[PDB]
Amino acid sequence: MKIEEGKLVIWINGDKGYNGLAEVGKKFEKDTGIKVTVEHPDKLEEKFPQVAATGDGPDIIFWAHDRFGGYAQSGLLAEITPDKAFQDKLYPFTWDAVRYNGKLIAYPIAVEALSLIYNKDLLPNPPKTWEEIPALDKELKAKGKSALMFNLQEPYFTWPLIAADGGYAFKYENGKYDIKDVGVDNAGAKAGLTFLVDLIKNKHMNADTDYSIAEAAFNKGETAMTINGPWAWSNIDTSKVNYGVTVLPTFKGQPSKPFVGVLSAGINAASPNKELAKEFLENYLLTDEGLEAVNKDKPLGAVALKSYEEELAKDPRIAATMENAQKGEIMPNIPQMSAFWYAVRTAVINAASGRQTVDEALAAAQTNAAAEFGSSYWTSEYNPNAPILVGSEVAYKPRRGSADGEWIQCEVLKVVADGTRFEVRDPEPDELGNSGKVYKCNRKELLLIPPGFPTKNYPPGTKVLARYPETTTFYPAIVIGTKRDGTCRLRFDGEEEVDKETEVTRRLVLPSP
């Protein structure tokens, strides 16, 4: 039998109520005699398909519904079978969010939408518009505070601003999303991102601000505002900050349009515990008592279960959540959402860092929003391993090339075999002295070179592969330190005598497999 049989393993993101979920798990254990294990792995959304593809992984996976169409398409999610009476318990619109190719592929849990969260003491009257934040910031800077801080590393948080004046993902036509009609590069999208970049250029925000930094700053009363979802309210409650939750600011007179997510629970198609998982989800979790346990740990938002949402509706923070939801748009769940999110993340981060102009960033995003891509077999906490698409720069290990653990900087010309194989062009001359040779390779023979300026520094001592200055070749090296600007001080283990120190751009320093 599969190692997975005879137990129930559940994965949910670390920012949500996993302890509350485990309480529901315990109630289930008492009745069934079966162990339930709740885990919250890092990079969950990408980790799931990694393990589920081998027939392993959790029996149940929790995530916003946008990822689930891709999971289902890849054959990773079982069709669920709630009867009509169970379906009646949840809002019809939540079920629509978990339908793929006409079949239900997950149980809806809760509606999530970003809201403006503000410190009432610092800012009793929050701004109605994005346009007034610059002035507000300079006033707060004079008192050692800032106006606004939110995660600039995940495009989820910047999307409401991009969409405000006309930006969109995929156009919905003829009862379906048109993957050839992408709106990430229109006048509206450009206007939104430009405003964001201008905030950074004018020292109103830092391009390096991530989730952790933004949350800490708000919860310590150092910033007047933040942009986050219901899950975050719990930590703010503990902080003692006198906060309110309200409608996001308008941009160019238009309401901000956050992408609305439906937190959903899918069943692993390879799971030998499917009926058990159904019972858990339908009869334990999706009950007033079950959702209450999770909600009390970390607020779920507007829950899909009507009976319980009736209790939560009176909450002004929930009213604010739904007001923003109403102004926003439920995300598509099509498989192209993975490429879309990669494209917009790269564009936002690159425009923020100055790696690209807004027009350059969004032009590339439009090209790659629905593009085929692969991932490198090798993963790291320091560099992403995806997407590898046409035009990506990669480090390639030739099968009969240079012997000293060296890789060549190549360009991806083609993604084939369902993203599992690549054609890459070698700028260096082959054994016949001819440069520009195209090679076919698998996922283990290449590493993704970041298309931007990585924010994550290597700790001293880290073993790396770095391009030698003036060359297009990667050599083994150790990280000695990191300059203030992020440049890596390296010691190439290459020469035969002295420990020199060579500076190399962080983008060209890769984690050794």
Ligand X SMILES: OC[C@H]1O[C@H](O[C@H]2[C@H](O)[C@@H](O)[C@@H](O)O[C@@H]2CO)[C@H](O)[C@@H](O)[C@@H]1O
Ligand Y SMILES: N=C(N)c1ccc(CO)cc1
Q: Select 66 or 411, whichever has its Cβ closest to Na ion.
A: 66
The CA distance from 20 to 295, in Å, is 7
Helix pair angle (288-297, 18-32), 10° resolution = 140
Residue nearest to Na ion (CB): 463
Residue nearest to ligand Y (CB): 306
The CA distance from 499 to 493, in Å, is 8
| Strand pairing category for 421-426 and 407-416 | antiparallel
Binding of Na ion by 163 (CB under 5 A):
yes
The CA distance from 53 to 48, in Å, is 8
Binding letters toward ligand X, positions 398-437, x by CB under 6 A? ----------------------------------------
Both tokens of residue 239?
Answer: 């902080």
Among 66, 165, 185, 445, binds ligand X (CB under 6 A): 66
Q: Select 276 or 318, whichever has its Cβ closest to ligand Y.
A: 318
Helix pair angle (187-201, 337-353), 10° resolution = 40
Q: Select 289 or 310, whichever has its Cβ closest to ligand Y.
A: 310
The CA distance from 127 to 122, in Å, is 12
Q: How far is the CB of 391 from ligand X (least distance, A)?
A: 21
Q: Select 308 or 475, whichever has its Cβ closest to Na ion.
A: 475
Binding of Na ion by 329 (CB under 5 A):
yes
- Work out what residue 423 binds among Na ion, ligand Y, ligand X, none; the CB cut-off runs from 5 to 8 Å by kind: none
| Strand pairing category for 509-511 and 463-467 | antiparallel
Which residues touch 367 (CB under 8 Å, ≥6 apart)?
A: 343, 391
Whether the CB-CB separation of 299 and 233 falls below 8 Å is answered with: yes
Helix/strand/coil for 261: strand
Interacting residues with ligand Y between 301 and 330 (CB under 6 A):
306-307, 310
Q: How far is the CB of 91 from ligand Y (least distance, A)?
A: 8
Q: Which stretch binds ligand X (CB under 6 A): 29-37, 148-156, 382-390, 410-418?
A: 148-156
Binding letters toward ligand X, positions 193-232, x by CB under 6 A? ------------------------------------x---
Whether the CB-CB separation of 298 and 29 falls below 8 Å is answered with: no
Nearest to 233 by CA among 62, 117, 109, 113: 117
The CA distance from 482 to 477, in Å, is 14
Q: Select 164 or 304, whichever has its Cβ closest to ligand Y.
A: 304
The CA distance from 394 to 387, in Å, is 11
Q: How many residues form the binding site for ligand Y (CB under 6 A)?
A: 3
- Work out what residue 250 binds among Na ion, ligand X, ligand Y, none; the CB cut-off runs from 5 to 8 Å by kind: Na ion
Binding letters toward ligand X, positions 155-194, x by CB under 6 A? xx--------------------------------------
Binding of ligand X by 67 (CB under 6 A):
yes
**Which positions touch Na ion (CB under 5 A)?**
163, 168, 250, 253, 329, 463, 476
**Which positions touch ligand X (CB under 6 A)?**
13, 15, 45, 64, 66-67, 112, 154-156, 229, 261, 341
